[PDB]
A and B are shown apart, each in its own frame.
Chain A
Amino acid sequence: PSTWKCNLCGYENDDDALFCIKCGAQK
């Protein structure tokens, strides 16, 4: 697996993005 999950929200966030797209939390 090579994506990262946000903890505050539950979005599967690509390692391309340093900030979560759904909620804005940092990596």
Chain B
Amino acid sequence: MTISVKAELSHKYSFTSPLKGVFRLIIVPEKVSTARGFHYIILLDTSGSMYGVKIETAKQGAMELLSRIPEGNKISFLTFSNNVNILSEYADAPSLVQQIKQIRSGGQTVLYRALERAIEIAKKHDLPGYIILLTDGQPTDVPETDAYEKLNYPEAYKVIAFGIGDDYNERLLKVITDKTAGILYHVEDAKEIAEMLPQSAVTEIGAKNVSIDIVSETQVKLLNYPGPPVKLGAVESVVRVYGEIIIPPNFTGRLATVKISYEDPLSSRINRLEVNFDITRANDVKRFLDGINNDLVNEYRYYELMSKLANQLNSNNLSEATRTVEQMQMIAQQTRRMELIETTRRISESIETTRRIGTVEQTRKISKEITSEVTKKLRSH
């Protein structure tokens, strides 16, 4: 029913140089209530390559997903592949079961036109929501990733993409999710679809229609969310928003103010939260460096490097990928956090083995795996 905010800046004092301050906003949902008033838009690829276990498992998972969504929500279902086909628009689930059962495989993949249609449908109404997308191959209408960069996605609509198999374009889906504060799930086995797709249903939330505005006297740059302002349809689990802000030399005063607004999903009340980053000028270097939260600097750098890692594997720069994961290891071990240390081992782990195999087959695989993991680490649990 509510949201709590802890906001931390890396620097307490400024000094003689332009400084790259980094900040973290931790948003915690409290006493979570049933999620209602959301518009789920499902985009299912039914191309020829989908024939078999992939599409039957997707159909069953879709029905289970519809079962899991609470009742006060609207559902749209699209099937795209040779042409876009709307099964239902802004409706309820009972309509779809019979139609889901008649889905057939066949045709190319027209992801661009399906996304355009999903955007139009989302923009037909004033509800936040989600775009649940499953595909197993590249788009055949628009394979250029830059085109998916330029789309005007609906605000407060998070894209949950399920990339199936070894033939889709992980970089394109990453662009989609990055532009929509979304999540990319790599699915290597169709089995995974049956347990994973229903989890994209949001049952209980701490806030609805969240708006994070950042009023700064200097340039502000978010790491893992579009904005500022950040427009999140809902808060289901802890949100960590990372960003950078240029602290000018010898600055003193109110550097930035973060205003968070949201709707109580139960009381339907507008709550507004306000945090101030007040900085002073340091008159000594030891006095300036003691004002640095080095753990936050290391955490921000860690996630920066992880984003770079996804990009580098997408670019086949395995050498830089190795150097990057190594730095992530050093950061994890410097923070003495078991969770980060293992996560980084598991990744270095894979990168070294791919360098062993030294084939596009394997590089392209771990690219998918790690590209998904980046989005998951940066925008959930």
Using a CB–CB cutoff of 8 Å, the interface residues on chain A facing chain B are 7-9, 19-26
Contacts and interface: CB of A to CB of B under 8 A. Distances in A.
A24 B20 contact: yes
B18 A23 contact: no
A25 B297 contact: no
B301 A24 contact: no
- If over half of A's interface residues share one DSSP class (helix, strand or loop), that class is named, otherwise mixed; here it is loop
B247 interface: yes
B190 interface: no
Interface stretch (B9-17, B256-264, B357-365): B9-17
Nearest to B298: A21
B335 to A, nearest CB: 14
B21 A8 contact: no
Given A8-B288, A9-B289, A24 B16 contact: no
B303 to A, nearest CB: 13
Contact of B21 (A9, A22, A24): A24
15 contacts: A8-B288, A8-B289, A19-B19, A21-B297, A22-B294, A22-B297, A23-B292, A24-B11, A24-B19, A24-B20, A24-B22, A24-B297, A25-B17, A25-B19, A26-B20
Interface string B156-182: 000000000000000000000000000
Contacts of B22: 24
Contacts of A22: 294, 297
Nearest to B285: A8
A26 B18 CA distance: 6
Contacts of B247: 24
A2 B62 CA distance: 55
A1 B247 CA distance: 30
Given A24-B11, A24-B17, 4 more contacts: A8-B17, A8-B288, A22-B294, A26-B19
Interface string B293-312: 01001000100000000000
Contacts of A8: 15-17, 285, 288-289
Q: Which of A20, A22, A23 has the most CB of B within 10 A?
A: A23
Interface residues of B, number: 18
For the complex of A and B, the 10 pairs showing the least CB-CB separation, nearest first, are A19-B20, A25-B17, A24-B19, A26-B18, A24-B20, A26-B17, A8-B15, A21-B301, A8-B285, A8-B17
Contacts of B11: 24
Nearest to B244: A19
Contacts of B17: 7-8, 24-26
Interface in B1-56: 10-11, 15-22
A25 B19 CA distance: 5
A7 B16 CA distance: 10
Highest count of chain B CB atoms <10 Å: which of A7, A19, A23, A24:
A24
Contacts of A9: 289
A25 B18 CA distance: 6
A24 B18 CA distance: 8
Contacts of A24: 10-11, 17, 19-22, 247, 292, 297
A23 B17 CA distance: 10
Contacts of B20: 19-20, 24, 26
A25 B10 CA distance: 13
Nearest to A25: B17
Nearest to B301: A21
Contacts of B10: 24
Nearest to B20: A19
Contacts of A25: 15, 17-19
B12 to A, nearest CB: 12
B33 to A, nearest CB: 41
Contacts of A19: 19-20
A14 to B, nearest CB: 10
